[PDB]
Amino acid sequence: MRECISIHVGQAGVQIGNACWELYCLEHGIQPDGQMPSDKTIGGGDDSFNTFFSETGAGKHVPRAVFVDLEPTVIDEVRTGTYRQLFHPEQLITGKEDAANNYARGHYTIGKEIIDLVLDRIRKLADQCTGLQGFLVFHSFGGGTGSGFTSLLMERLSVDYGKKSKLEFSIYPAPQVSTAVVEPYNSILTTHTTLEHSDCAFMVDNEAIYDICRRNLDIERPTYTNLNRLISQIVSSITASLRFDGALNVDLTEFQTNLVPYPRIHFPLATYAPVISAEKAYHEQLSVAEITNACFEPANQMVKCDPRHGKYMACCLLYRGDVVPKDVNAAIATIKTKRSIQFVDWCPTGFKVGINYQPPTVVPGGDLAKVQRAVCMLSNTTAIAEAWARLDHKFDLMYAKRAFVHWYVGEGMEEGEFSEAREDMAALEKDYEEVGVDSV
């Protein structure tokens, strides 16, 4: 059992969903028609991949997933694209008119008209589970739908499924590919309203991904496709422990216990290696040591910040492929003797390690090399609060003049919601300060 349900919200969430499900199909040997010849138990089973896929009597393997957008053109591409047969039509839900980059339309004016249908389709998925574990929610911070509708949905899920865990994958805005001036408003509004409803959230900064694609894959001007394929490799590293078995495999829930010391402090920093082109991977085999070292190079982080000027509260290493513990231990010993790794005084310094043997996969025609071994580090560090600071400053500059605020008031919001949200962010920055001070 232990099933998980994925929810993909708005453009960014949908398109990242496409990249993730394509990659999962390649990892498990599922064809685009849904057939899986290696699966000899027809119509059911409790194999590890059944946490993410259900099975019909006709042998089709069907994602446990809902896609939601308030306009139709992005999800229409899924309806007509390569993987159109993977999904039942009731899983693909669209309205007619979007939120126009406005949190208030996604949470209230437009969002209210579709929330009950979305919840009922989710209920249909939940009823097929024999031991549902929780939810995975994919969305942008900056869009009207990804911010406001996601907020609304999280509130309703807490009502209908109680304390059942909810995890986020959240796209943090960058000016190089950003399309709206108001993205800082939406980011604070959704972060305030979701903070009590989420158990754990993985932020992905578009500027970090853009930089990595340019520097390591030699792509002059990266597209959404490049970014989403790399993101999907990180997501796959995180969920691999849920989707494959094995004796050195370590459950993600067990990492959550270690990653979250207080309910509000639930935002891990992800780092992935190696990201390398085919031309450079040739005749250059990367060892366990080289990739483990690369996990402490800030240029490989998913969020721009400097862990060397904060403190660690947890540090986890998720290996996949041709990796044995002996080489892990030698690499860790070296890193401990060489780098600036300072823990808070109320927390032990041991690194937690997992190994999955199933090797990494790449998509055909991609810009990533196929490699024999890879690693994802997840750290809980105070340095991540720098990203909140950057966003809060931009919020202040505009709000002092009330710029664009009339667009929100016209949909029924009050200024009090702006200032209440901003205060909650101020208190979060203060929490991150308090957890790094020494005991007395």
Binding site: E71, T73, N101, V181, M398, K401, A403, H406
Partner: protein, 420 residues
């Protein structure tokens, strides 16, 4: 999805027709309404501006309005005149004689209901109407007064749809008709309250461009309208061809309008090459379609649209360069206020082009000019009997003047604001 287009009065109808000619040419639609293009990119978002009729015929979603009949004849004989729906022509007999009060309160009020019937029939069959664009001048009688009446009535029936205008501002260099500053102030008073977006197309600037830069010693209306049609084509490019960007009129408005009253834009066009040259030229005062120096104010927001095949890396680098070297002209309290679009399909007869849309506080210079001419007459009450004879009070003139002065003062307030 669907946009409904309205053209009112002589000026509005002439530039409307040119707009429909240029975009019909860009989409490969002939005067009979048949598609004979070479590329699927031409039809993918065709329905934004065109209806499909039987026989795969494409008919503009366009309504044609005047109090003067005969402009209807000149349109109908124009090259694309057969393409328009015959029932969409709504024309009176009387004329308005350059009198705003006739357009807004008397002759135009009688006809407005028949105009609304056609509007409603077109709107009812839209899958998902985004809103409306109107072309008119502010200096005559029909387009200014009756057009702003139409705007008010549409807002009553579609209060949640976007209302956009392309509004031609008068200049003594093109028309000597003496009452024009009255008509423009009275219309602006309406526009501040009831539109989401107004492109200020200034006949002063168009004349100076035709004379100095294009070297036309005696500019005709045709030369001015060539510039207008190229600008309007540029500014609707991002809705009209498939291309990285997923937007509707409301999301554009949300990106461009930080305060509801400050929604009067300065358009530009280049050339009248390399990406640095286009970029330098589009930010030059001499390329603006409003007679304003942007270095006499600050930008609240800017959109830049490039057309043709070129390097996106290079476009990004040049936009950053202009911002870095001209940083004093962008208000510091709105981060990331410059947006860029690239369309692969060039306009007819050019390999590369740029269209500029600016929300600048320097637009106050335009409003000041008009204001000066207004006061010069109002202080002697010259020609006022033309308007009071239609039932108007002096008081309405006083209020309109006051509101335009307030708009100026507000632009100055945001020009002087700082961050610390």
């Amino acid at each position: 999805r669907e946009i409904v287009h309205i053209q009112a009065g002589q000026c509005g109808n002439q530039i409307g027709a040119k707009f429909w000619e240029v975009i019909s040419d860009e989409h490969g639609i002939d005067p009979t309404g048949s598609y004979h293009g070479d590329s699927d990119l031409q039809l993918e978002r065709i329905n934004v501006y065109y209806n499909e009729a039987a026989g795969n015929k494409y008919v503009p979603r366009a309504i044609l309005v005047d109090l003067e009949p005969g402009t209807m004849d000149s349109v109908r004989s124009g090259p694309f005149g057969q393409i328009f729906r015959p029932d969409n022509f709504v024309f009176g007999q009387s004329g308005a004689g350059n009198n705003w009060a006739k357009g807004h309160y008397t002759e135009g009020a009688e006809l407005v209901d028949s105009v609304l019937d056609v509007v409603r029939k077109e709107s009812e069959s839209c899958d998902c109407l985004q809103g409306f664009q109107l072309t008119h001048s502010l200096g005559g009688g029909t387009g200014s007064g009756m057009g702003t009446l139409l705007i008010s009535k549409i807002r009553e029936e579609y209060p949640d749809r976007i209302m956009n205008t392309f509004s031609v501002v008068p200049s003594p260099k093109v028309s000597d008709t003496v009452v024009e500053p009255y008509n423009a102030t009275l219309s602006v008073h309406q526009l501040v309250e009831n539109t989401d977006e107004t492109y200020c197309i200034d006949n002063e600037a168009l004349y100076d461009i035709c004379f100095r830069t294009l070297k036309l010693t005696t500019p005709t209306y045709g030369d001015l309208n060539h510039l207008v049609s190229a600008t309007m084509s540029g500014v609707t490019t991002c809705l009209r061809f498939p291309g990285q960007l997923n937007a509707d009129l409301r999301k554009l408005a949300v990106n461009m309008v930080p305060f509801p009253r400050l929604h009067f834009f300065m358009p530009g066009f280049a050339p009248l090459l390399t990406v640095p040259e286009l970029t330098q030229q589009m930010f030059d005062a001499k390329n603006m379609m409003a007679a304003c120096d942007p270095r006499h104010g600050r930008y609240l927001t800017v959109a830049a649209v490039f057309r043709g095949r070129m390097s996106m890396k290079e476009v990004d680098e040049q936009m950053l360069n202009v911002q870095n070297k001209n940083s004093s002209y962008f208000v510091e309290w709105i981060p990331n206020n410059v947006k860029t679009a690239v369309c692969d399909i060039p306009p007819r007869g050019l390999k590369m082009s740029a269209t500029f849309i600016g929300n600048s506080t320097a637009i106050q210079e335009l409003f000041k000019r008009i204001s000066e001419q207004f006061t010069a007459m109002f202080r002697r009450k010259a020609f006022l009997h033309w308007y009071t004879g239609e039932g108007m009070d002096e008081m309405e003139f006083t209020e309109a003047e006051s509101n335009m002065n307030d708009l100026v003062s507000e632009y100055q307030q945001y020009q002087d604001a700082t961050a610390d």
